Amino acid sequence: TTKDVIQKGISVVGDLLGVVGFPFGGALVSFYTNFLNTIWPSEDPWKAFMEQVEALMDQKIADYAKNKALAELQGLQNNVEDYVSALSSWQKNPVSSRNPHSQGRIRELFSQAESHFRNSMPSFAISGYEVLFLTTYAQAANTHLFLLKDAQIYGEEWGYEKEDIAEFYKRQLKLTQEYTDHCVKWYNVGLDKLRGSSYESWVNFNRYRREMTLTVLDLIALFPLYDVRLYPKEVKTELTRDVLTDPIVGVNNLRGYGTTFSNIENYIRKPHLFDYLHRIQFHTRFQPGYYGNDSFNYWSGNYVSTRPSIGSNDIITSPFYGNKSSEPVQNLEFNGEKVYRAVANTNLAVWPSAVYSGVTKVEFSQYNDQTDEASTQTYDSKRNVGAVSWDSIDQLPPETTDEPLEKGYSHQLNYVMCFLMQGSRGTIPVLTWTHKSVDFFNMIDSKKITQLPLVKAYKLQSGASVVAGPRFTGGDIIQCTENGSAATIYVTPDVSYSQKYRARIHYASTSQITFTLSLDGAPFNQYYFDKTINKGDTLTYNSFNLASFSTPFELSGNNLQIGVTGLSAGDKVYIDKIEFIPVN
């Protein structure tokens, strides 16, 4: 269920990934048309976003609050549509038909929409309904900010006063912070409200966490890239966060046997450097049926192997998960394959006073971007397979239903982990996924501003570690507690010639610090950076600073090392991303 809103959520983020930073006019208009068809066609999507959280929370919005929200939204739709048609005409029409009279038409259309947004926002955040309005607020907030940046692109062409464009920009800055912070605060409120002790508690908890990531968290991660002044070129970026699909189970009610909340949540993958699915070792066991004829084999346990980020080749192999095989082991290898789908079969045996159920078959859809070919790999228990009951596509829809799945998919398989039920009753598999936007090669684009998340590093040092992200950066971050090296990340230059770059860093620090950059062990850039937080502060939007290094440089190597100094006992530095700006 709710796949509709999930698809819309996924698609918008996927489309925005193409118009982030300073977009070219044609691209901006194209975006806007899909945007209007997806998010702003009628009241249906908005109604579905409210129902979505109501379902996750098992609570309802007071009818009056629901109706007012929908009323505001009808009005905002007209404002957006009227605006887009005018913008579309403006781009299309030559720099001749631009008379003072048409300029005033577009200026007032724009002023109306922007103003209507600021006025309406509070309606999506009424006291007591903050969490339930989250996806609605997130989508409305996004529209407001995306709309705002247009004033910095076309402001002068439209004949706006210098004062007007500037007023819009300050307003954009303030709202980027507020909207981001509002979303994280209420996101967390909702998350804590769902923490329980039962297996059923964890499924709900995790479903909320995944759905809020796809519709809210992924979106707010893009907000900063709408600043066309800081990002005067197109931006190459990616989302590095993990999402866990619902557990694969044969029965709807496990009658108390489900793995406890703590035995799941405390054991899922913790903040780690980015990696990719390399190999899976399937363990099978025999489940006897009370009458023999109803027996079946099932997936009892597993081993998983991942390969690190580019720059390192040593394979990481997981501890054993679940139960050892009673049957012959099955191994599937994925080196250079992207698993974009997983479809599973389950089966059950009804005993006089017990029910036994397990995953009997798993078909993986893979795509090889090198040899531009899709294919499948499957796990088969070999005995009494039953029927398909679980499809990843229901939880992780494609970015586009236009192209074939091997092209339009939104996520790939990263991890597999088997949990044991209570009372030796069976196995529960849990799958972890990563976003499609992740570039394996860590490629530095010669025409765009490239954002490199630090989690893409292949080596941490001097006691640097991966820490849970503040929920608004699209992934995790690096924590530095000691003076010295911190991370080594492998970089792939896209051009052969001596292209020069400027580097920018997105960080948070308890003290004034010095960042040093080295290529293949040789220092090339060193600079001074401001303190952004006090010891013990929690990380919100304003905790981070984006600062440039003075001198330009060439990519005369691949191994980028970031070093930190100037820390005192108790000081902490958090690194989110390193950016590259193509310069002449």
**Closest CA relative to residue 136, chosen from 211, 228, 52, 224:** 52
* Cβ neighbours for 396, distance < 8 A, ≥ 6 positions apart: 10, 243, 245, 410, 411, 433
Residue at which a domain ends, from 409, 437, 465: 437
Q: Do 452 and 577 share a structural domain?
A: yes
Q: Where are the beta strands (DSSP E) in 384-534?
A: 387-391, 411-420, 427-435, 443-444, 449-453, 459-460, 465-467, 477-480, 484-490, 492-493, 500-509, 513-519, 522-529
* Cβ neighbours for 581, distance < 8 A, ≥ 6 positions apart: 233, 449, 501, 502, 503, 504, 548
CA 260, chain centre distance (Å): 27
Q: Do 213 and 346 share a structural domain?
A: no
Q: Where are the beta strands (DSSP E) in 241-317?
A: 242-244, 275-287, 296-308, 316-317
Method for structure elucidation? X-ray
Q: Do 563 and 506 share a structural domain?
A: yes
Cα–Cα separations (whole angstroms), residue 295 to 280, 289, 290, 473, 488:
25, 4, 8, 48, 52
For the chain, what percentages of helix, strand and coil (3-state, to nearest 5) are there? 35, 30, 35
Mark residue 112 as left, alpha or beta (left: phi above 0; alpha: psi -120 to 50; beta: remaining).
alpha
Residues paired with residue 377 on neighbouring β-strands, in sequence order: 364
Burial (Cβ within 10 Å: 0-12, 13-18, ≥19) of residue 584: exposed
Structure tokens at 137: 């607020």
- DSSP-derived letter for residue 46 is H
Q: Do 480 and 569 share a structural domain?
A: yes
Are residues 5 and 214 in contact, defined by beta-carbon separation less than 8 angstroms?
Answer: no
What are φ and ψ of residue 397, in 5° steps? Answer: -60, 170
Measure the CA–CA gap between 292 and 286, rounded to whole angstroms. 11
Are residues 348 and 250 in contact, defined by beta-carbon separation less than 8 angstroms?
Answer: yes
Task: Give the CATH number of the domain where residue 308 resides.
Answer: 2.100.10.10
User: Rounded to the nearest 5 degrees, what angle is found at the Cα of 403, between the Cα atoms of 398 and 408?
Assistant: 30
Q: Do 443 and 351 share a structural domain?
A: no
Task: Give the CATH number of the domain where residue 578 resides.
Answer: 2.60.120.260
Burial (Cβ within 10 Å: 0-12, 13-18, ≥19) of residue 534: exposed
- 117's enclosing H/E stretch is helix 100-120
Q: Do 508 and 566 share a structural domain?
A: yes
Q: Do 466 and 352 share a structural domain?
A: no
Q: Do 555 and 491 share a structural domain?
A: yes
Residues paired with residue 429 on neighbouring β-strands, in sequence order: 418
Residue with tokens 């009673």: 326
Q: DSSP 3-state assignment of 165?
A: helix
Q: Do 401 and 449 share a structural domain?
A: no
Measure the CA–CA gap between 354 and 257, rounded to whole angstroms. 11
Burial (Cβ within 10 Å: 0-12, 13-18, ≥19) of residue 540: middle
Q: What is the dihedral of CA 177, 182, 184, 188, to 10 degrees?
A: 160
**Closest CA relative to residue 114, chosen from 141, 136, 153:** 141
Measure the CA–CA gap between 337 and 535, rounded to whole angstroms. 44
Residue at which a domain ends, from 168, 201, 229: 229
Are residues 56 and 19 in contact, defined by beta-carbon separation less than 8 angstroms?
Answer: no
Structural domain total, the chain? 3
Measure the CA–CA gap between 133 and 126, rounded to whole angstroms. 8
Are residues 517 and 561 in contact, defined by beta-carbon separation less than 8 angstroms?
Answer: yes
User: Rounded to the nearest 5 degrees, what angle is found at the Cα of 462, between the Cα atoms of 552 and 476?
Assistant: 75
Are residues 430 and 244 in contact, defined by beta-carbon separation less than 8 angstroms?
Answer: yes
Q: For residue 321, what are the domain limits?
A: 241-437
Q: Do 554 and 491 share a structural domain?
A: yes
Residue with tokens 């993958």: 269
Measure the CA–CA gap between 243 and 212, rounded to whole angstroms. 10
Residue at which a domain ends, from 229, 258, 287: 229
Q: DSSP 3-state assignment of 357?
A: strand
Q: Where are the beta strands (DSSP E) in 370-426?
A: 373-380, 387-391, 411-420
* Cβ neighbours for 389, distance < 8 A, ≥ 6 positions apart: 248, 250, 344, 345, 346
Q: Do 248 and 234 share a structural domain?
A: no
**Closest CA relative to residue 198, chosen from 209, 190, 206:** 206
Residue with tokens 């936007």: 437
Pairing of strands 443-444, 492-493: parallel
Pairing of strands 459-460, 484-490: antiparallel
Burial (Cβ within 10 Å: 0-12, 13-18, ≥19) of residue 566: middle
Q: Do 501 and 387 share a structural domain?
A: no
Structure tokens at 174: 């303030």
**Closest CA relative to residue 273, chosen from 240, 243, 303, 244:** 240
Task: Give the CATH number of the domain where residue 76 resides.
Answer: 1.20.190.10
Are residues 416 and 282 in contact, defined by beta-carbon separation less than 8 angstroms?
Answer: no
Cα–Cα separations (whole angstroms), residue 466 to 217, 453, 459, 472, 488:
19, 12, 11, 16, 13
Tell me the residue type at 282.
F
Pairing of strands 235-236, 449-453: parallel
Measure the CA–CA gap between 584 and 582, rounded to whole angstroms. 7
